Write an enzyme that holds these catalytic residues in place. Structure first.
Site, PDB file in Angstrom:
ATOM      1  N   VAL A   1       1.065  -1.015   0.140  1.00 43.72           N
ATOM      2  CA  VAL A   1      -0.299   0.514  -0.151  1.00 43.72           C
ATOM      3  C   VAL A   1       0.964   1.267   0.029  1.00 43.72           C
ATOM      4  CG1 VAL A   1      -1.792   1.189   0.951  1.00 43.72           C
ATOM      5  CG2 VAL A   1      -1.990  -1.162   0.926  1.00 43.72           C
TER       6      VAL A   1
ATOM      7  N   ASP B   1       6.489   4.054  -8.389  1.00 39.42           N
ATOM      8  CA  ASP B   1       6.058   2.113  -7.359  1.00 39.42           C
ATOM      9  C   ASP B   1       7.564   2.012  -7.283  1.00 39.42           C
ATOM     10  OD1 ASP B   1       6.224  -0.548  -7.708  1.00 39.42           O
ATOM     11  OD2 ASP B   1       5.256  -0.716  -9.987  1.00 39.42           O
TER      12      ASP B   1
HETATM   13 CA   LIG Z   1       2.684   2.884   2.792  1.00 40.95          CA
END
Ligand SMILES: [Ca+2]
Length: 316
Positions: free
Chosen positions: A292, A299
């Site tokens: 998360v 990324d």
């Molecule tokens: Ca996180």
């Protein structure tokens, strides 16, 4: 499977924080990273270290890592390794490169507090008067969240704070004097050092990167989290998101400047700095918790993968 990340020498991932290569004994510290790199041809080994004392103490994390490095070499027939460390793991990696320079090809640190953490300093100040830390809502929050990540413990809340002792400004200052590195910049410059070092006649490639999600504001007072949008699900599904905004705000009030919630930009600089503008908090750097990250966070899996290709291209 391809060979995009197929480096010449094995890659060792070196964790930081409370201990072992798992969070709450079940979650991989480097979330989803090992399988990704392996699918791209890399030979990856994950260190598992313990202890709250200095990295260079007897049977400390440094010695543990060195022993591990020797087992990897002996089993693979390889002569050197690439070390990639996160948080304290960057300090641990530095020990091995200093005492066994011939066994290391490169050292990469991710969000390593080479010059200490102002939050670790804050905790040390508070326990001097409140041996509990709880008079501080920030500390309480930090403990509540990070205590759940501690593996193999009977006092996870205690151990969550114990992991900060080696990261103080004072402790790292001592460490840097005993274990100097060309990769570090001059004192008080907030500049990095050299891209390479030659030690024991062995050349090492030196790299680093960090996150700066937490930024100072003129008005959590005085800080904002740039990794998340307005209404971000990461604020709900990942309890470390708001916890690290709170700790980062304390850091900013202690003159840290932009940070990832535990490590400032200036403290993270080491060797060739790839970037420090990632919109990341300290756990986003390792794809946590459970993958998360806020809507503006890059990324991390792709970032690490690209770096292992970078190493391959450099000949290690
Ligand atoms: Ca996180």
């Amino acid at each position: 499977a391809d060979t995009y990340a197929a480096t010449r020498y094995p890659v060792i991932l070196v964790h930081g924080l409370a201990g072992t290569d798992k969070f709450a004994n079940v979650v991989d510290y480097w979330y989803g990273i090992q399988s990704d790199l392996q699918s791209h041809g890399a030979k990856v080994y994950v260190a598992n270290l313990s202890g709250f004392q200095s990295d260079d103490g007897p049977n400390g994390r440094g010695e543990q890592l060195l022993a591990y490095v020797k087992q990897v070499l002996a089993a693979t027939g390889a002569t050197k390794v690439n070390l990639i460390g996160h948080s304290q793991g960057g300090l641990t990696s530095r020990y091995v490169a200093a005492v066994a320079p011939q066994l290391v090809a490169s050292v990469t640190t991710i969000g390593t507090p080479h010059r200490g953490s102002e939050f670790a300093d804050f905790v040390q100040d508070v326990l001097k008067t409140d041996p509990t830390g709880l008079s501080s809502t920030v500390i309480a929050a930090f403990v509540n969240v990070f205590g759940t990540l501690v593996s193999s413990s009977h006092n996870t809340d205690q151990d969550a704070l114990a992991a900060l002792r080696t990261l103080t400004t004072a402790q790292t200052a001592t460490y840097n004097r005993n274990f100097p590195s060309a990769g570090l910049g001059a004192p008080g410059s907030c500049q990095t050092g050299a891209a390479t070092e030659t030690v024991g006649g062995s050349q090492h490639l030196l790299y680093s990167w960090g996150g700066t999600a937490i930024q100072p504001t003129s008005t959590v007072t005085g800080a904002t989290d740039t990794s998340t949008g307005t209404l971000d699900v990461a604020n709900v599904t990942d309890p470390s998101t708001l916890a690290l905004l709170a700790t980062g705000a304390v850091m900013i009030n202690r003159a840290s400047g932009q940070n990832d919630g535990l490590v400032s930009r200036c403290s993270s600089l080491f060797g060739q700095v790839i970037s420090t503008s990632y919109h990341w908090n300290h756990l986003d750097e390792i794809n946590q918790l459970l993958g998360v990250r806020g809507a503006n966070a890059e990324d991390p899996v792709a970032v690490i993968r690209t770096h292992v290709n970078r190493l391959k291209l450099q000949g290690v």
